[PDB]
Design a protein around this ligand. Structure first.
Ligand SMILES: *CC(=O)N1CC(C(=O)N(C)[C@H](C(=O)N[C@H]2Cc3cc(O)cc(c3)-c3ccc4c(C#N)cn(c4c3)CC(C)(C)COC(=O)[C@@H]3CCCN(N3)C2=O)C(C)C)C1
Ligand SMILES: Nc1nc2c(ncn2[C@@H]2O[C@H](COP(=O)(O)OP(=O)(O)NP(=O)(O)O)[C@@H](O)[C@H]2O)c(=O)[nH]1
Ligand SMILES: [Mg+2]
Lengths: 168, 166
């Protein structure tokens, strides 16, 4: 049998949720920005020698559409919480997404990974130490990614699968 | 004296005529926002809605259009030389047929708009309501069959022609 993992990608506008997902699904990156409402993808992968089916829900909506996003998040078994290293608001918003996950999953212990995206950029407004401290305070992994160079992309999604497997 | 203007869209589906939708624009309560939509509908400033598509159609919620400058729903422009301020929030998203401005946050009105197909109260106070379907709500309902849960359309829904009536 092949186990299926329902992974949900959340975070503020423009942080790279879709670019990260498309790197995983389609192995490329583009500079074009196509704003998301919601898009779902499926892909078979091998993780630690075991073939697995990933369902990726790529979300959007920030606070104005958060009540609608609840319904997609309720499907998820694990979450990527994405901010961009050059976007202070996106880091300050992580708390909101964390609280939304805990509420919709009705649990204090939900598989999650903090993702600091756009690590290819030559400038940044959020310290790596801030993100490490936030992830430690949540008890979750922190992974630095770039959808542009593919740095950390597989690690972010595969780590999230391992977090799900440890929760069960 | 000036009565609230009436404008029309002739809608096409993959190039095939579907029907006409007309709108009353509430110039009496939101004159600047109504005037923008009116002038974009006639094309009298040399740009406007004619030929543009409804790039998001969400059944049970709304049909969004008005991007005549970009390919990804990020474009459009107002008649005011710049994005313009939220004029007021007097009017609410009370039910099907309401015409309201799309935006990217406060004071970012351009040309994009949406036509509600249901009451959308959660949008009150963030999107400026400025008109309402007068005739042809059945055409808007027919358009919904080509939308989906995330707004992606299965046929290309265009404003084949548009202008002012009466
Ligand atoms: C995130 C960011 O920085 N930007 C700039 C982009 C932007 O604002 N536009 C492209 C503008 C626009 O289309 N505004 C739009 C509001 C909106 C934009 C985007 O990109 C996504 C959503 C709304 C959104 C996301 C998720 C979501 C869920 C869920 N889960 C549910 N809904 C969501 C909307 C509600 C609907 C009914 C399924 C879809 O709602 C809309 O599409 C919304 C309805 C009101 C009018 N409107 N779109 C907007 O004003 C452009 C005008 C430049 C994103
Ligand atoms: N330099 C760089 N740019 C990136 C990276 N990830 C995404 N981008 C760029 O940032 C923009 C937004 O990316 P996108 O994936 O659409 O962001 P999103 O979080 O899905 N936005 P939305 O919430 O509206 O759906 C695009 O122009 C994209 O090319 C990255 O790792 N590095
Ligand atoms: Mg996206």
């Amino acid at each position: 049998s092949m186990t299926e993992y329902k992974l949900v990608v959340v975070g503020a506008c423009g942080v790279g949720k879709s670019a990260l997902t498309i790197q995983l699904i389609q192995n490329h990156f583009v500079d074009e920005y196509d704003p998301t409402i919601e898009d779902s993808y499926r892909k078979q992968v091998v993780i630690d020698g075991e073939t697995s089916l990933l369902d990726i829900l790529d979300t959007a909506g920030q606070e104005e559409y958060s009540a609608m996003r609840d319904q997609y998040m309720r499907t998820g078994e694990g979450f990527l919480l994405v901010f961009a290293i050059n976007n202070t608001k996106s880091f300050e918003d992580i708390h909101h997404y964390r609280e939304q996950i805990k509420r919709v999953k009705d649990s204090e212990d939900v598989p999650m990974v903090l993702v600091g995206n756009k690590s290819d950029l030559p400038s940044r407004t959020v310290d790596t130490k801030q993100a490490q401290d936030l992830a430690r305070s949540y008890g979750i992994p922190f992974i630095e990614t770039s959808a542009k160079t593919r740095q950390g992309v597989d690690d972010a999604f595969y780590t999230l699968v391992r977090e799900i497997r440890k929760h069960k | 004296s000036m009565v609230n203007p009436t404008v029309f869209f002739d809608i096409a589906v993959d190039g095939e005529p579907l029907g006409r939708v007309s709108f009353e624009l509430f110039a009496d309560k939101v004159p600047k926002t109504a005037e923008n939509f009116r002038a974009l509908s006639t094309g009298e400033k040399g740009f406007g809605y004619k030929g543009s598509s409804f790039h998001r159609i969400i059944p049970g919620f709304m049909c969004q259009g008005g991007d005549f400058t970009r390919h990804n729903g990020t474009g459009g422009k107002s008649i005011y030389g710049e994005k313009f301020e939220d004029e007021n929030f007097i009017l609410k998203h009370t039910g099907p047929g309401i015409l309201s401005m799309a935006n990217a946050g406060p004071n970012t009105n351009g040309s994009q708009f949406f036509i509600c197909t249901a009451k959308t109260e959660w949008l009150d106070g963030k999107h400026v309501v400025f008109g309402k379907v007068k005739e042809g709500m059945n055409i808007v309902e027919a358009m919904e069959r080509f939308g989906s849960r995330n707004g992606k359309t299965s046929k290309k829904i265009t404003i084949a022609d548009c202008g002012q009536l009466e």
